[PDB]
Every structure is written in structure tokens, then in C-alpha cells.
């Protein structure tokens, strides 16, 4: 009698909170709802896959996509089920096609579809099972198309948060390396271009959110400092002064998460430096660590190059102590933010 009501609620993608005022409506209203739920079960998912494979272009593609988005947003989760992997696949093929040919509205609309597709358990699962799903999301982070970036970013941020499949932040980062190494640009460059003054606050908030989401779930302090200093190198420190200014409640929460994490990481890494300074108090000690630990490693060529860079100043120079004191400050700010 109320059994078909229980499934309706689940099929409308509502949590226990959002179900509550619906569970209180009297049997009379509940009975009319289930009927108009059974009636609403517009063209089918099959027709959309049909069209997505039918070579739509510009304006005609957009209409289709706008119409798919509504379906993915407004129909029961079960309709989304019918769309499923098959529909996601063809939806992702078009996204690729669009990248392979010099509308950003068509690109944006597929992401709007993706957003609706992923607001439910099934949607996220199916997206995670794709080979090219997360890369295509990363590639949609165009600072030239702010609204698409915000949408891509927000979805990407929700994936990093995911405990269920392990190391989702590493899966996102992986995808960001992949798009960087095809675009021939720095992997975190879009994130920083999004934070430039002139961009919208919503985009700024999105970028920091993703930055935070990449760093937060990381348990290893080396990982956190590693990506943070990769950020810092592309000038994050200075753009961060700018954002510390703008009076927005959403930006302040994201700066706050970032600063709290950078502080705790500073503390830990400073503790590591106090320890190294207690034990390895002279060159012999320090040289042994390099020979044991860095020499014959994959790290050898880079560490050697740092050493070499430190020796371009002449022995004669009357101010090398001072120079090296300045370099030390620079290296220090790089390693310890």
C-alpha cells in the first residue's frame, strides 16, 4: 500500500532529510503521488544515444544536449539507469570530438549533463568505471570558459573527497598530469589562471576548492608539501595575498582550509628540520646521507644539479657568505612555505 512510495523516494534521489516532509504527507496525497510517479515513467534514453551517435553539430547538437540535461536532472534515477554506461560512452565520445576540432557551449552542456548524471550513486560509480571519464573532466577546466571550469572543478572536487574508492585524489592528479603532457603546459596552470584577479569569485572559489581537495585526503606529509610547492612555484603565494583581501564568505572558508593545512604541515616539516640540525651538524654527516641515499638513485641527477647551481659564484667574491645567506632564505621558503 505504501511500498511503492518507499521506492519512489529512492528513485527521486533524496536523502533522509529531504524525504522527511514527504513521509509526513497523509495517505491521500501519497496515493496521488505514486500514481503520477507511475505515469511519468519526454523521449526515452535509447533515442538520446541514437542522436548522440547521429553526428549532430553546433546549434542542433546543443538542443539535443540541453534536452538530455533536463532528462538527466528531472527524471527518476531509474531513467538515468537506462541511459547508463552506453549513454555515458557516447556522451564522452562527443566531448572528445569537440576537443579534436579547433562550440564551448556544446562542451559546457555535456558537463552540465555530466553534473546531473553524477549527483547520484549510480552516476558516480559509472563515471569512475570509465577509462577517459576523469581526464575529460580535467580537460573541461578551461579558464577561458569560467562556468564550465566551475562545473568540472566542483565535480572533480567531490571525487577527491570520496573515501569509497581509495586514493581518488591521486586518480584526479594522475589525470591532470595526463592533460598537462598532451597540452604541453604545467599541470596546475589552469588552476592558477583561474585564480588570477579578473576572473569571477565563483571560479576563484572553485579553484581553491579543488586545490584543497587534492591536498586534504593525502595522509603523507611529503605528498602535501610536494604538490603545495609545485603550486607555490607557479606563483600561488602572491595570488594568495590577493584573495586574502576579497570579502566573500566562500573564499574565506577555502583560504581557511588551505592555511590551516599549510600551518600544520609547516609545523611538522620544521620539526623534521630541527631534527636534521641536531643529528647532521656538519658536512661529513650530510655527505654520507647524500652518498647513501641520493647517489645511485633516480634522484641523483637533480640533486647534483642543485649542488652545481650553488657553485656558480666565485671563491673570490667578497660577499659570498651574504649571497649564500640570501640563497638559503630562498631555498628555505621553497622547502618550508
Amino acid at each position: 500500500v505504501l511500498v511503492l512510495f518507499e521506492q519512489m523516494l529512492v528513485d527521486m534521489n533524496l536523502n533522509e532529510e529531504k524525504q522527511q516532509p514527504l513521509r509526513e504527507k497523509d495517505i491521500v496525497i501519497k496515493r496521488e503521488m505514486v500514481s503520477q510517479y507511475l505515469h511519468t515513467s519526454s523521449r526515452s534514453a535509447m533515442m538520446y544515444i541514437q542522436e548522440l551517435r547521429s553526428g549532430l553539430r553546433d546549434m542542433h547538437l546543443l538542443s539535443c544536449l540541453e534536452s538530455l540535461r533536463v532528462s538527466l536532472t528531472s527524471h527518476p534515477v531509474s531513467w538515468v539507469q537506462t541511459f547508463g554506461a552506453e549513454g555515458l560512452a557516447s556522451l564522452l565520445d562527443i566531448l572528445k570530438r569537440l576537443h579534436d576540432e579547433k562550440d564551448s557551449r556544446n562542451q559546457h552542456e555535456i558537463i552540465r549533463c555530466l553534473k546531473a548524471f553524477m549527483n547520484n550513486k549510480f552516476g558516480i560509480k559509472t563515471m569512475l568505471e570509465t577509462e577517459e571519464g576523469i581526464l575529460l573532466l580535467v580537460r573541461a577546466m578551461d579558464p577561458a570558459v569560467p562556468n564550465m571550469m566551475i562545473d568540472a572543478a566542483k565535480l572533480l572536487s567531490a571525487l577527491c573527497i570520496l573515501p569509497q574508492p581509495e586514493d581518488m585524489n591521486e586518480r584526479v592528479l594522475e589525470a591532470m598530469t595526463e592533460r598537462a603532457e598532451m597540452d604541453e603546459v604545467e599541470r596546475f596552470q589552469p588552476l592558477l589562471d583561474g585564480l588570477k584577479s579578473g576572473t569571477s569569485i565563483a571560479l576563484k572559489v572553485g579553484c581553491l576548492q579543488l586545490i584543497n581537495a587534492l591536498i586534504t585526503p593525502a595522509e603523507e606529509l611529503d605528498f602535501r608539501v610536494h604538490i603545495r610547492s609545485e603550486l607555490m612555484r607557479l606563483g600561488l603565494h602572491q595570488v594568495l595575498q590577493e584573495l586574502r583581501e576579497i570579502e566573500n564568505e566562500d573564499m574565506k572558508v577555502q583560504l581557511c582550509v588551505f592555511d590551516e593545512q599549510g600551518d600544520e604541515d609547516f609545523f611538522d616539516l620544521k620539526g623534521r628540520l630541527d631534527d636534521i640540525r641536531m643529528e647532521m651538524d656538519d658536512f661529513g654527516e650530510v655527505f654520507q646521507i647524500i652518498l647513501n641515499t641520493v647517489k645511485d638513485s633516480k634522484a641523483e641527477p637533480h640533486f647534483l644539479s642543485i649542488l652545481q647551481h650553488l657553485l656558480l659564484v666565485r671563491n673570490d667574491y667578497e660577499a659570498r657568505p651574504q649571497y649564500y645567506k640570501l640563497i638559503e632564505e630562498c631555498v628555505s621558503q621553497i622547502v618550508l612555505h
Binding site: 528513485d11 533524496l14 511519468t40 519526454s42 534536452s67 536532472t73 528531472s74 527518476p76
Partner: protein
Amino acid sequence: MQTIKCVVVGDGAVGKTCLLISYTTNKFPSEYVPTVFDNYAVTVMIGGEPYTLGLFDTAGQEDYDRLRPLSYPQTDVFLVCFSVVSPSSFENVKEKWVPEITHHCPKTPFLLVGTQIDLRDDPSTIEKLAKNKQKPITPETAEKLARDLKAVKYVECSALTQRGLKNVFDEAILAALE
């Protein structure tokens, strides 16, 4: 009971419920309670003849996106609402609302309804918008959007003062009767 079925949609905090309460009960609820779905009913005399209007209030929240379409079957007229002091809601008339009602109810007419029109000249509201590089939607901007999205026409009201409120629903009946 058969009635002229009129469904009301638009962003949260645009003023749909107030518009309905204010029109049908002549009272303005001070407290805000996000609506899931509610029914209202009114009788309007046109040339000495009773016309009965069934008013369906829907949720502005994205969380009930999948619930809303239950209000849609056999709709005779839609009111697509935005607040004239929220450019955000005005944009969603175009990106979200019109394409949503179009999808479920193609070729059933709709009115573009501007709400909270009393706050259009409120300096406190105007400055809040200006700090965000935004401004109120003028009637003439709204009329342009109406023609573009193929709405029947643009109407506007304040639910607080009731200015232009009766006209909204007189115009909704007319649109549904055509």
C-alpha cells in the same frame, strides 16, 4: 475537481509561495519555509462568470529536481518566476526553468513573472547588487527575454504590496483560455 491548472516555478527565495499566499489569503507570511509542494485554489469572476484556478506551488531547491515533474501533468498554464532584484534567478529562467517546463509540457503556454518588484527602488538592495557589479532587471529587459523564450507575456508584481498581483493571475487565466 476540474480547474485551470496553473503551476508556479522559479529559483528558491524568488517569492512564489508568498505570491500565492498573498494572492489567495491577502496575508504575507513573514517566516521563510522552503516548499516541497503545496496546492492552492481561487475563484475569479470574469464578466459575471466564475473561473476556477488550481495553483500548484513547487520547490525552488535543486534537491527536489526529480520531485517537481510530478506537478506537471495536464498543466494549462505555467508561471515562471524570477526576482527583479536577483539577476541570478533571471538567468536560470533561461538555463533551467523554461527548458524544464518545455521538456515536460511542450506547447503549453507560460508567463514570465517578475517578483519582489517593491525592492527594485530599495537603495539597500541596489547597493548590495552594485557591490557585485549587478543591477535590478528592468521591465524592458524582462520583456525582451519573454519574446525570446516565446512566453505569452511578461507580468510583474510585489507580493508585499500586492501591486500588479491580481493582474498576474488574470493574465494566467487568459493565457490558459486561448
